[PDB]
Design a protein around this ligand. Structure first.
Ligand SMILES: Nc1nc2c(ncn2[C@@H]2O[C@H](COP(=O)(O)OP(=O)(O)NP(=O)(O)O)[C@@H](O)[C@H]2O)c(=O)[nH]1
Ligand SMILES: [Mg+2]
Ligand SMILES: [Mg+2]
Ligand SMILES: [Mg+2]
Length: 405
RNA sequence: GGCGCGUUAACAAAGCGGUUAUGUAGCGGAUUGCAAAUCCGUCUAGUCCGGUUCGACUCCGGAACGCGCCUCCA
């Protein structure tokens, strides 16, 4: 008769991002294990429990995001483990759309790779405010001077995308060794093992660097949909991180974006990690039960909002920076008619570029402003950041400056 | 969420890194006494957006839509 989520401690959303195989998943399992040893609430999550799909089992990689909860002495967490493969960045963006802070995982053996800087840029344009790096796989590095070099380059990479690279906490360690340790003896506490302690160093960094975001509960409700489930006996459920406002049961909301209609529905449920919540407020990784709505009347990319608060749009001008050749972007310029993919929070959508009279071409590494017309409407705001991806690579990072309509 | 499959002109159906495959009706037009048979003409050719190239329907990327199969239970 179920289990309510009591706000004993402040809740913050986190996740793991970084190049493929750098360790994101192992560290996630490691986090739940060490945190559990101290806090008995944390349900342990093993590597197999993270990458559970058969494609992930055989192919040996994280293809879609995984949601895991744990907590320290100070705050509760909702951890979203992201894919590092270049082919599945589409899903990496969706995870970053729910992070109040992100853990940048960088293998000491390889250093900052293509998806390292790619996730920095992307996470930024999807809302991720602060970052906590974690030099993983130190157990494979002999020369200490090399680890210094790794740390230095990761700081430069953060400062390249306007993050506070010099102030960002860089915790060296080894997720594999810490996880292994937690298996042999799960009673292990702080100060008992050096590898386990390096993970506690991490939890402490998260606790002290990533602040508990200012909650905008005074603004109109807005809940970017991240996932849609079909729960037997209950109905259709939407999940995501509340951006602003609050939501108690019996509240009416609109499903805006990716559809001509602006469907209405009443909420018959609200839960934070399988736990019923009184009323989910901003920063909550909820799960709302939508009345009358079917398994396909709502989808990721849309947005649950206060009825009337948002009116979906398609046209808009924005200030954009086209990535350079050596940033994983284009090597050739483009013109009007170019139809790339645009990313606004949990939304991916094709749009057409309309260059202004006076400009004919746009070269890589140029900061330019232009109009865009999406093939579908979506919750847009002046100031909202976004991404432009095409051909498997990110090509531009922009900011909405005026909604044409 | 993932993987696969389908997209050439009004429709049908090919080959090919470059100098015109091709068929078939709907319409138009010569023509017929009027038709018919037969020719002349017609119609978004490579769904769309990028890359390689002197050159792309053809090669490599992406996207849209459609359809299947797993995954997807706060
Ligand atoms: N030597 C060593 N190996 C490690 C460490 N952490 C993880 N590994 C190993 O490195 C490999 C990749 O780890 P991973 O699966 O990524 O935890 P990923 O970044 O989640 N992968 P993906 O990007 O595909 O989602 C695995 O073989 C894992 O066991 C570490 O600290 N040291
Ligand atoms: Mg992983
Ligand atoms: Mg089939
Ligand atoms: Mg459930």
């Amino acid at each position: 008769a179920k289990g309510e989520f009591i706000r004993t401690k402040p809740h913050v959303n986190v996740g793991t991002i970084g190049h493929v195989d750098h360790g994101k998943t192992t560290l996630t399992a490691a986090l739940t294990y060490v945190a559990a040893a101290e806090n008995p609430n944390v349900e342990v999550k093993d590597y197999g429990d993270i990458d559970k799909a058969p494609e992930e089992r055989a192919r040996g990689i994280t293809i879609n995001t995984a949601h895991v909860e744990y907590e320290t002495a100070k705050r509760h967490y909702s951890h979203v483990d992201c894919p590092g493969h270049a082919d599945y960045i589409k899903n990496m963006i969706t995870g970053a759309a729910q992070m109040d802070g992100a853990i940048l995982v960088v293998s000491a053996a390889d250093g900052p790779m293509p998806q390292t800087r790619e996730h920095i840029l992307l996470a930024r344009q999807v809302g991720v405010p602060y970052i906590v790096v974690f030099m993983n796989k130190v157990d494979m590095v002999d020369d200490p001077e090399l680890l210094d070099l790794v740390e230095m380059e990761v700081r430069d990479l953060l400062n390249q995308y306007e993050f506070p690279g010099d102030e960002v906490p860089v915790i060296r360690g080894s997720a594999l060794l810490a996880l292994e340790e937690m298996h042999k003896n799960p009673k292990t506490k702080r100060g008992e093992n050096e590898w386990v302690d390096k993970i506690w160093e991490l939890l402490d960094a998260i606790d002290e660097y990533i602040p508990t975001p200012v909650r905008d509960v005074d603004k109109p409700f807005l809940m970017p949909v991240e996932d849609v489930f079909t729960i037997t006996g209950r109905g259709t459920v939407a999940t995501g991180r509340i951006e602003r406002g609050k939501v108690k049961v019996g509240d009416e909301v609109e499903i805006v974006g990716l559809a001509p209609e602006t469907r209405k529905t009443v909420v018959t449920g609200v839960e934070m990690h399988r736990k019923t919540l009184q009323e989910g407020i901003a920063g909550d990784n909820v799960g709302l039960l939508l009345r009358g709505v079917s398994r396909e009347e709502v989808e990721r990319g849309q947005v649950l909002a206060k009825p009337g608060s948002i009116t979906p749009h398609t046209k808009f001008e924005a200030s954009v920076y086209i990535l350079k050749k050596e940033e994983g972007g284009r090597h050739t310029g483009f013109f009007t008619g170019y139809r790339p993919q645009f990313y606004f929070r949990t939304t991916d959508v094709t749009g057409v570029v309309r260059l202004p009279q006076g400009v004919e071409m746009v070269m890589p590494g140029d900061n330019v402003t232009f109009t865009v017309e999406l093939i579908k409407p979506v919750a847009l705001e002046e100031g909202l950041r976004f991404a432009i991806r095409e051909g498997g690579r990110t090509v531009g990072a922009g900011v909405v400056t005026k909604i044409l309509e």
